[PDB]
Write a structure and sequence with these properties.
Chain lengths: 425, 426, 426, 425
């Protein structure tokens, strides 16, 4: 069981660059592809992400995609830049100009053939794979433009493999581009059918977590990409290391999704403590579970207290005990009996692994499927509402062949999605 | 006189791991299979200084079996006995029974036949599995269906783990634990039910252990199995055989769900202050605070019970201790059972495993009673399954894998009828 | 009692190379021919401390035989026993039979008569060759044609390598492997068919070898030839000779294609756990997973079969083990064969070659069944030949060398009748 | 089994100069004819290409032919120039001026006698030869004009020995001479009946392989001649070194040619890797097999995807395993069942040798006889039609004695070959 990696645009590449810095140190490899580890459990499942090479070297199964050559220049020269194979870097020369229309129809259609030739090469080399990881953002043009195109083309060829996309959805309070609502609405139109499991993150909330819980006075894009990676790495720790009770990517999908369209998730991580307040803290499971369910710690700008949890999960790492995980989970359900659906008994999925993150004793990851997402999509639909009334900025997109009908479907399908979550709330 | 044990899934393999460390200590056989008699019941001898078990390890995922392959007990197991897959059933019964079932079910059925060729007096099989996941439920249900046709009248025993009503670990558990009932009902000669949360209370109070993890619970099940088969492996005052045991215990063909309990379990330091004699260990077996499934016998009426003593026991008092119990109106028996005790006294004291959580004793007791108290452990579950099935939640996963929507009707209809039979006899 | 071996082509020499290293180990003879008895069956002694084999090496290309001339075993043979040509047949049977073969066929026949003069009790000749190239087929078919007329009634055995239906390395293979059918049919007393595919699966599964190359496959064939003739070279409880073995096996003059299999082949580490007894080894020979040709006996009815045990075997149980097999309806025999077994027990254990892929064992079995299932190994192939012959591809190469366009009529006609007989007797 | 060499024209000499530079280093021979090797297997068949001299020196079986003395001066003074015997350099004084009429009738007639006395002298020196190697181009006058005259005279004397031609056929996209189409068509008229098997190579494609796969920014005739040499060196490696399974020139000819006229081949070589991307590559047979069949690597300017393969070959070098070669060959046939002819099963020939190229662990050579050549001859034929229609440049050739009949059959006969390949497609 091994998984290939796809990154798109400036947003994804900056997120994806931190991933290979963190997971590489986890498996003990140097910056030049060499190995110098100690524990044998590192080599047991090294191949879930890497490919072997001559001379005892490893290279990752990553693809970096772009429509401008600037960002590849940064990642190539940066730390851990020589790990990647040169053939994997796929980039154009023109750019997107924050156009969803240019990315899908005009510019990306020429460059789409090149990448599928590469992902086909990585798909044959792997013996028995399960999923693809996609990293992108929903504001710009390249990430939402080609990111939508590959997903449709990837899905058709492989309708039996699981698909993962780790999306970043825009927020009004940190709004940055005049044409954001046009991009975000058009892309989610096809994520409602062409992906299996979807994560949503906000730059607004990642600012809420960074100042208050971390006591960060200078949150740059260095640290935010740090936080998303640790949630990204935690989900697939059952694959790379053993455990008392196991859960791979396929188990979670069946356990959380009651109906095919309700697969928009909310991350959360614990512990997250400041550099000075760590000495004054305990080391126990009950402190972890309270932090996980805290409405003050989620990674989306939506409060769960306006809705009820459908299903949740908890991924624990370290030497722990099975009852204590069991007793904490029942405490929350009984104390918070108002905030959980009634007609699904025992809504919590559990998993414990063995190897803790280096320098720590315990950890936890929360993936909780709630009905509070319906607000995070209505807010966007409102910003899109006042623009399409007067056809502002419409001429830029209409030049590449779209029509007023397509924008009509963009609102209608977004209308359908919010309706479904309200009905089951 | 030989038996074959089959471990299926993570739950079965983990329990089977605990047992085979227990058996080796009993017979003085080192992990590399060499002995520094009676061992033919589970072991096969190869030339000189080599014993290998009559066990087969089964899984659809390599993770929980390759832990054995590298561990301390790599040399004991014959390499062909460890069967692994490539993709797990992902907690789908439908994937276990239908899609991911047949590409592996054939290999083990070929491997069972090889093991059943060496034996001369095959007694029966022991099956270890759980009702939680589809890998241990969907596949194990398929194995028993193929075993029954090929072998027919030979007795098969299982040791199943029932999901708890409150302390449960998954979301879709009720869907699995209802679909296994048909193949257990129609294809099992004796079925043992054990609950996970109940073993926690026994660990908390009697053993005074703060945090029981899955290591210690699996050590407890090893003690129950070892005692039932201790009648074949050794010799004593009275003898009870597996086919003998079914005759006295099971009153009707549809009613084969005994409840198990053990005595004594005690900590090392508190073992000094008490004197453990036959008079009380027969009373400890009947405490509702020591039943291994969260059910109250006070709302049920006993139909039979078997008491297997081992160590230093004399038949002069056992009849007296059994006589004492009969005079209580709290412990109720049915009217059509003028006598309901089957007794077996053995000579070999139970052996304590080093690194364990139990103290060395001179005598031990294992109890196996067929009561109607267990009717509730199914009625509560059927509410959970029916409540979720009202909205057809999660069903889309199972429908696409080969099932149809009326299949869940038979799952509830069968449990509808089976609860009536216990009501009728009660 | 002496026997003479002839090797043809790259396939024959490579197979012959492995065997003649194997024989030297058996009789304690160093590569330089000196021994630090019974060896007269294969060896000739010259004065004092010099033994040379009864071998002859034949090829039309200097490359492969020169490897023997330089290798570690240069000193064993006469210089004159190693015969090489100048231009290979280039995978042309027509070149082999008519053009290039005739300039060398005389030289070896003069050499055969020289070796046949030394012997006093000649039983027959052993031929190792393959149906792939014309050099190994066209010359061999000519070479037996000369042997049969000159010597008449003495028995000749062949050990052929049949082309696989799927895993093959040439383009024009079917044309050769049909034209060889006539000469083998009417000029060979017994023909052994061995396939390149099946030996791979045997290496993969049973031996658990990751990358079997031609070194290991040739070592497997060396064991089969060593076992058949161990009845002559040693002494035992019961004896079966070549003339004796042909009598019991070949029921009609046209049905002489036994299928071979060997037991046991086991890896070193997996050998420790299993106790190899005669009861199971006689069962391993009948597994269709261990037949040396990609053929299913399940679609055929056995006609006869011969067992060649060696090591520590007593006749008390062999009849018991043979009796066990006869009770299976899976293993089917023809109605006019109430008895279909020839048994020979020898006293010498098989000897393991250092650097090989086998472990030292006390017992060994060789099976030789004349079954009717082998009809399919030709029926599939005749489709390949006939499909390509539809458009008359490649024929211009063969026509210019002296063959006629009608010559391919008899090639498919002869296989038409030969396949007809098996369904008739079956 | 030892073979003599013939070179014609400026193209052939520049191709042929590198072959003797490469093959000499393979056998350990120095630049002055001495020997300083280590492995004995070099000397086992050293005679396959060289002839013995007194004093422990070696000289090759080379014949250099020319019609202008400029090129002979360069090859004589170049690296490895003193290896050749001085008598072998045969060259005239007038030149051809890109006239196929002059190459056959006027200027080659006087000089043809001189060379045939030399090739006879090598034909008497040989003990038991098999073949002749001819290296030339189809664009100029000397190479086609003399080369077709050499082949015509050589064939009649030796009707049974095998004849090899490694031709360079022109391409429209790298067109360099105004009268190329007249030259190419008139020569191919007689390669149909006077040679045994022919290799076709395009200067257009060798640019594609150099820029793309090799990442070469400046492909000069120094590097293009490097590529072709490795193919000629690879075909006859079974003759010079041992192996598990062998294949000489006679085995390939019978295994490739279903009908006498379908003997035009396309080579291909693997691996070909840049100096930076080699560290990030595996070393296995399965990577080698896919590269050969890649339509982006085949060394002629025609797409095999436009047709179906008749037969193929594969000469492997290195210490390898025999089933691994066998298993991959069935993988390609099963996966690509659309692109192979149906009425000939198991269309692949195989050969494995032991001595690998110096400094490398593995190698492979691909020879594929396809039906896709029928297009590579139509493109040339079209260029000819627009010329002979209006009799442009015709007067230059008619002055030496050809007629409109000779040009008429030139298209008529080349019409037949396109007919055959389409018929069996
Ligand atoms: N006693 C015991 N119970 C376990 C253990 N592991 C899991 N369980 C129980 O098993 C239930 C979940 O289903 P499982 O038995 O784990 O299914 P599985 O073992 O994953 O089988 P597969 O899905 O095929 O891998 C939970 O309710 C646990 O109580 C164990 O190691 N020991
Ligand atoms: N067992 C075995 N089979 C071989 C070997 N080499 C080639 N073969 C088989 O031979 C077939 C090809 O025809 P060959 O027997 O090789 O023809 P040849 O050996 O070259 O004989 P000549 O053509 O006269 O040189 C292939 O299909 C292989 O199966 C070998 O070394 N061992
Ligand atoms: N989390 C995170 N978000 C980023 C980063 N850089 C840009 N973004 C977000 O990405 C959105 C715009 O996406 P964009 O960069 O235009 O995508 P692109 O056109 O494909 O490069 C903005 O709303 C930013 O908030 C980063 O380093 N980290
Ligand atoms: N591969 C290769 N082709 C060449 C070289 N030099 C010339 N050519 C090709 O040869 C063609 C002309 O043939 P030419 O050599 O001039 O014939 P000539 O009259 O004998 O010199 C042109 O189309 C060139 O592309 C070389 O060094 N290598
Ligand atoms: Mg599992
Ligand atoms: Mg040969």
């Amino acid at each position: 069981r091994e998984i290939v990696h796809i990154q798109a645009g400036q947003c994804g590449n900056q997120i994806g660059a931190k991933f290979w810095e963190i997971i590489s140190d986890e498996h003990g490899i140097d910056a030049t592809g060499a190995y110098h580890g100690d524990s044998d459990l590192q080599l047991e499942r090294i191949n879930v992400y890497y490919n072997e090479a001559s001379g005892g070297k490893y290279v990752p199964r990553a693809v970096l995609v772009d429509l401008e050559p600037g960002t590849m220049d940064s990642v190539r020269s940066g730390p851990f830049g020589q790990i990647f194979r040169p053939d994997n870097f796929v980039f154009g020369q023109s750019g997107a100009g924050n156009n969803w229309a240019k990315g899908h129809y005009t510019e990306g259609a020429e460059l789409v053939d090149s990448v599928l030739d590469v992902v086909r090469k990585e798909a044959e080399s792997c013996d028995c794979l399960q999923g693809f990881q996609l990293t992108h953002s929903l504001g710009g043009g390249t990430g939402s433009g080609m990111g939508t195109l590959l997903i449709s083309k990837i899905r058709e060829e492989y309708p039996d493999r699981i698909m993962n996309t780790y999306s970043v959805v825009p927020s009004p309070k940190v709004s940055d581009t005049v044409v954001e609502p046009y991009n975000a609405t058009l892309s989610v139109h096809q994520l409602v059918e062409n992906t299996d499991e979807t994560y949503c993150i906000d730059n607004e909330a990642l600012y809420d977590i960074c100042f208050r819980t971390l006591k960060l006075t200078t949150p740059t894009y260095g640290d935010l990409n740090h936080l998303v990676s640790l949630t990204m790495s935690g989900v697939t720790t059952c694959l790379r290391f053993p455990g008392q009770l196991n859960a791979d990517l396929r188990k979670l999908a069946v356990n959380m999704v009651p109906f095919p369209r309700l697969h928009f998730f909310m991350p959360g991580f614990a512990p997250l403590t400041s550099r000075g307040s760590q000495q004054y803290r305990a080391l126990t499971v009950p402190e972890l579970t309270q932090q996980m369910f805290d409405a003050k710690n989620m990674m989306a700008a939506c409060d769960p207290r306006h809705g009820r949890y459908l299903t949740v999960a908890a991924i624990f790492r370290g030497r722990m005990s099975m009852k204590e995980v069991d007793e904490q989970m029942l405490n929350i359900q009984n104390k918070n009996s108002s905030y959980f659906v009634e007609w699904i008994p025992n809504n919590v999925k559990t998993a414990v692994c063995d190897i803790p993150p280096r320098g720590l004793k315990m950890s936890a990851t929360f993936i909780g499927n709630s009905t509070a997402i319906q607000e995070l999509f209505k807010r966007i639909s409102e910003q899109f509402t006042a623009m399409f009334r007067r056809k502002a900025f419409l001429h830029w997109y209409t030049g590449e062949g779209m029509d007023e009908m397509e924008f009509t479907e963009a609102e209608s399908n977004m209308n359908d999605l919010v309706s479904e979550y309200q009905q089951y709330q | 006189r030989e038996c074959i044990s089959i471990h299926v899934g993570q739950a079965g393999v983990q329990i089977g791991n605990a047992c085979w460390e227990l058996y080796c200590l009993e017979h003085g056989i080192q992990p590399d299979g060499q002995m520094p008699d009676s061992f033919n019941t589970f072991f096969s001898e190869t030339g000189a200084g080599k014993h290998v078990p009559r066990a087969v390890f089964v899984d659809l995922e390599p993770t929980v079996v390759d832990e054995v392959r590298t561990g301390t007990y790599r040399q004991l197991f014959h390499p062909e006995q460890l069967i692994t897959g490539k993709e797990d059933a992902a907690n789908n019964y439908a994937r276990g029974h239908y899609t991911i079932g047949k590409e592996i079910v054939d290999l083990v059925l070929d491997r069972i036949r090889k093991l059943a060729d060496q034996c001369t007096g095959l007694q029966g099989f022991l099956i270890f599995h759980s009702f939680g996941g589809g890998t241990g439920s969907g596949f194990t249900s398929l194995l028993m269906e193929r075993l029954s046709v090929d072998y027919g009248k030979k007795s098969k025993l299982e040791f199943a783990i029932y999901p708890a009503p409150q302390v449960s670990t998954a979301v879709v558990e009720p869907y699995n634990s209802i679909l296994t009932t048909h193949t257990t009902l129609e294809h099992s000669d004796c079925a043992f039910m054990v609950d996970n949360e109940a073993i926690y209370d026994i660990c908390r109070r009697n053993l005074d252990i703060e945090r029981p993890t899955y290591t210690n619970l699996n050590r407890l099940i090893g003690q129950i199995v070892s005692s039932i088969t201790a009648s074949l492996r050794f010799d004593g005052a009275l003898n009870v055989d597996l086919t003998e045991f079914q005759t006295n215990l099971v009153p009707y063909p549809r009613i084969h769900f005994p409840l198990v309990t053990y005595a004594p379990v005690i900590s090392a330091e508190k073992a000094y202050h008490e004197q453990l004699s036959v008079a009380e260990i027969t009373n400890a077996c009947f405490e509702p605070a020591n039943q291994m499934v969260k059910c109250d016998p006070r709302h049920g009426k006993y139909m039979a019970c078997c008491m297997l003593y081992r160590g230093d026991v004399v038949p002069k008092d056992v009849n007296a201790a059994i006589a004492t119990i009969k005079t209580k109106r709290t412990i109720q028996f049915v009217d059509w059972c003028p006598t309901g005790f089957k007794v077996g006294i053995n000579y070999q004291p139970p052996t304590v495993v080093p690194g364990g959580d139990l103290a060395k004793v001179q005598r031990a007791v294992c109890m196996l009673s067929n009561t109607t108290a267990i009717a509730e452990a199914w009625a509560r579950l059927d509410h959970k399954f029916d409540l979720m099935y009202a909205k057809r939640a999660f069903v889309h996963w199972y429908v696409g894998e080969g099932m149809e929507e009326g299949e869940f009707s038979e799952a509830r209809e069968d449990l509808a009828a089976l609860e009536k039979d216990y009501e009728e006899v009660g």
